[PDB]
């Protein structure tokens, strides 16, 4: 993994991209605002399975222990859902494209108590992507950075010092990769550094939205909010029988 | 105008703007639970010095008062935390809230819900330590937190463009520092990225800290709009 070129890094990330899923309901029937959370929950749950298989294709990720793979996904899963949402919504001002058949605006967000504030933050992030003219190759680098970065500070065993050093090396490679993309695009050295910072600073906002969103989901008092250790392990820990 | 400062002038302005290190307010002859009262009192006194510092960050006072207040509302606990982490850098295993208030994680356990965030703060300090973070870099990072934390949640696009122009100059300033220190272009990029990724962790800690503070049902957690505006002293 640490021997990939920038071009190989981009290529592997582009190839790992998960599909765009649809909301599960009959589109010949009228839409009901009262079904919204149900629809969003079912969508998130199905997306999680594809997220696990995307994560396994992120260079350097399966080199980690399964325990650490689980912890990174525990920390990052809602951030990853959210940056994916923002990316899908970038070309639809004022809207959030949860699915091609589930395109919502903030007035619809208002029907769920406590949701509109987060809605508004997601919309502003989509606006920022648009203002920056964020490219696909840049987007997949950012999403991989979220996966590797978000949980790396909340995990001192010898094996684990080895894990953190590996993560930091892979992160350095993704930085090189972003710079390569920007250079190949024709940006000056000054413009490369400035845009690199602009991209990375957005990740602080994505982390903020993830924490506000998590607090919001917990406030709904559903039985199931986060993916369990066991659920994630089961999905991550495949046998070699297939 | 602020946008015309050189990288060297930006660094000097930020170093000179640095706030003082305050002490905890307690009688050291008296027996030492009341931990939260001490920390609350400390943070409350730190805030006015934070406002004086923000007014000295180049470009900040070119914003409307309304927008200055919004930025401080968003950033104040992050700023207190990166300050704590910086002060704690040479004290492995402990958090230097003040020179007369140096606590370890065992003392953090005495307050329900605190030790998890305590541990995150200690880890961030260790990361700064291992990166050999310099004072010149620290004051750039802290200025970035002030300008960046609220910029995605706001004439208004003129204000945002201004903020992003100032952020760009601080990026330029960070790179300049690293170049003078003899880092290669590759190392310059990589170090900039490593520093900015730590800011996501600091945002995370601020979020969890805020939840914790709210979970204690205290008199009040966030500084009000009116308090901040008053301290800005129009
Ligand atoms: O609405 C959701 C959402 C709903 C349920 C979720 O989790 C359901 C619990 N489930 C339990 C098993 C493990 C996986 C999660 C997650 C997101 C989405 C979001 C959200 C927005 C605002 C807010 O205040 C809270 C969340 S963002 C998002 C992106 C998606 O691709 C899908 C759903 C979503
Ligand atoms: O303990 C505090 C703290 C206590 C009270 C605070 O706010 C009190 C409310 N006050 C109201 C008027 C405006 C200012 C805030 C803020 C921080 C500090 C921190 C903390 C750590 C862990 C955790 O779970 C929660 C907080 S971090 C910190 C750094 C400081 O320089 C000072 C206090 C602190």
Q: Residue for token digits 């990375």?
A: A200
Query: Which tokens go with B180?
Result: 């003078």
Asked if A127 and A93 count as a contact pair (C-beta separation under 8 A), the reply is yes
* Residue A18 and residue A85 in contact, taking contact as beta carbons nearer than 8 Å: no
Residue A159 lies in a domain: yes
The sign of the dihedral angle between the CA atoms of B8, B9, B14, B20 is positive
- Residues closing a segment before a gap in chain A (C–N exceeding 2.5 Å): 155
Q: Please report, for the domain that includes residue B204, its CATH number.
A: 1.10.565.10
Kind of pairing between the strands at A96-99 and A102-104: antiparallel
Residue B220 gets which letter from DSSP? -
Cα A98 to middle of ligand 1, angstroms: 10
Contacts of B125 in chain A (CB under 8 A): none
DSSP state of B103: E
In a domain? residue A190:
yes
- CA-nearest residue, atom 25 of ligand 2: B209
Q: Is A171 exposed, middle or buried (0-12, 13-18, 19+ CB in 10 A)?
A: buried
Q: Tell me if A207 and B204 make a contact (CB, 8 A cut-off).
A: yes
Residues 6+ apart with CB under 8 A from B109: B115
Number of domains in chain B: 1
Q: How far is CA B191 from CA A93, A171, A203, B99, in A?
A: 35, 11, 17, 30
Q: Are A13 and A144 in contact (CB under 8 A)?
A: yes
Nearest to B87 by CA among B21, B16, B36, B140: B21
Residue A164 lies in a domain: yes
DSSP B53-86: HHTTSTTGGGS-HHHHHHHHHHHHHHHHHHHHHH
What distance in Å separates the CA atoms of residue A214 and residue A211, rounded to the nearest whole number? 5
- Tell whether residue B212 is among the known ligand binding residues: yes
Nearest chain A CA: its distance from B98 CA (Å): 24
Is B207 in contact with A204 (Cβ distance < 8 A)? no
Q: After which residues is chain B broken (C to N over 2.5 A)?
A: 32, 154
Q: How far apart are CA B206 and CA B76, in angstroms?
A: 9
DSSP summary character for residue B18: P
Separation between Cα atoms, residue B115 and residue B107, nearest integer Å = 8
Nearest C-alpha in A relative to B188: A193
What residues have CB less than 8 Å from A18, skipping those under 6 apart? Answer: A47, A50, A51, A53, A54
Q: What is d(CA A209, CA A124) in angstroms, rounded to the nearest whole number?
A: 11
Give the distance between the most distant pair of CA atoms in chain A: 58
Which of B193, B208, B209, B214 would you mutate first to test chain A, the one with the most A CBs within 10 A? B193
User: Which of B76, B14, B69 minimizes the C-alpha distance to B44?
Assistant: B76
Residue A17 lies in a domain: yes
**Residue A242 is assigned to a structural domain of this protein:** no
Which two structure tokens, joined as six digits, stand for A179? 């710079």
Would A107 be classed as within a structural domain? Answer: yes
A102 φ, ψ (degrees, to nearest 5): -150, 75
Q: Using DSSP, state whether B223 is helix, strand or coil.
A: coil
For B92-120, b/e burial (b = at least 16 CB within 10 A) is: eebbbbbeebebebebbeeeeebeebbeb
In short, whether B120's Cβ falls inside 6 Å of ligand 2 is no
Chain A nearest-CA distance from B71, in A, is: 13
Distance CA B160, CA B150 (A): 10
Q: How far apart are the CA of B148 and the nearest CA of chain A, in angstroms?
A: 7
Quick check: A151 and B200 in contact, CB under 8 A? no
Residues 174-203 of A with CB under 8 A from B: 175-176, 179, 189-190, 192-194, 196-198, 200-203
State how far the Cα of B11 lies from the Cα of B139, in Å rounded to an integer. Answer: 8
Q: Contacts by B216-225 with C-beta closer than 8 Å and gap 24+?
A: B216/B36, B216/B113, B218/B40, B222/B73, B222/B76, B223/B47, B223/B72, B223/B73, B223/B76, B225/B69, B225/B73
Q: Within 10 A of A33 (CB to CB), how many other CB atoms are there?
A: 12
CA distances from B14 to B9, B60, B181 (A): 9, 12, 19
Rg of chain A (C-alpha set): 18
**Helix, strand, or coil (residue B127):** helix
Phi, psi of A222 (to 5 degrees): -80, 160
Contact A35/A76 with Cβ under 8 angstroms?
no
Rg (alpha carbons) of chain B, rounded to whole number: 18
**A53 within a domain of the structure (yes/no):** yes
* Residue A241 forms part of a structural domain: no
Distance, in Å, from the CA atom of B110 to the CA atom of A2, rounded to the nearest integer, reads 43
Question: Is the separation of the CB atoms in B83 and B127 below 8 Å?
Answer: no
- Domain, as residue range, for A210: 6-236
Q: What is the rounded CA–CA span in Å between residue B215 and residue A127?
A: 33
Among A40, A88, A101, A224, say which to mutate for ligand 1: greatest number of ligand atoms within 8 Å of CB: A40
- B111-118's contacts with Cβ under 8 Å and 24+ in sequence apart are B111/B35, B111/B36, B113/B212, B113/B215, B113/B216, B114/B212, B116/B208, B117/B205, B117/B208, B117/B209, B117/B212
């Amino acid at each position: 993994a640490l021997s990939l070129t920038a071009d190989q890094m981009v290529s592997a990330l582009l190839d790992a991209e998960p599909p765009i899923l649809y909301s599960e309901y009959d589109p010949t029937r009228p839409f009901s605002e009262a079904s919204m959370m149900g629809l969003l929950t079912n969508l998130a749950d199905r997306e999680l399975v594809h997220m696990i298989n995307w994560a396994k294709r992120v260079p350097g990720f399966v080199d980690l222990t399964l325990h650490d793979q689980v912890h990174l996904l525990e920390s990052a899963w809602l951030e990853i859902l959210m940056i994916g949402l923002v990316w899908r919504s970038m070309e639809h001002p004022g809207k959030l494209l949860f699915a091609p058949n589930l395109l919502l605006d903030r007035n619809q967000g208002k029907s769920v108590e406590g949701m509109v504030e987060i809605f508004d933050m997601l919309l502003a992030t989509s606006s920022r992507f648009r203002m920056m003219n964020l490219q696909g190759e840049e987007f997949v680098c950012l999403k991989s950075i979220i996966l590797l970065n978000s949980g790396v500070y909340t995990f001192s065993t010898l094996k684990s010092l080895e894990e953190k050093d590996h993560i930091h090396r892979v992160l350095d490679k993704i930085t090189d990769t972003l710079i390569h993309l920007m250079a190949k695009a024709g940006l000056t050295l000054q413009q490369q550094h400035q845009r690199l910072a602009q991209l990375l600073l957005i990740l602080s906002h994505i982390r903020h939205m993830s924490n506000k969103g998590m607090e919001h989901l917990y406030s709904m008092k559903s039985k199931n909010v986060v993916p369990s250790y066991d659920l994630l392990l089961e999905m991550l820990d495949a046998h070699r029988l297939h």
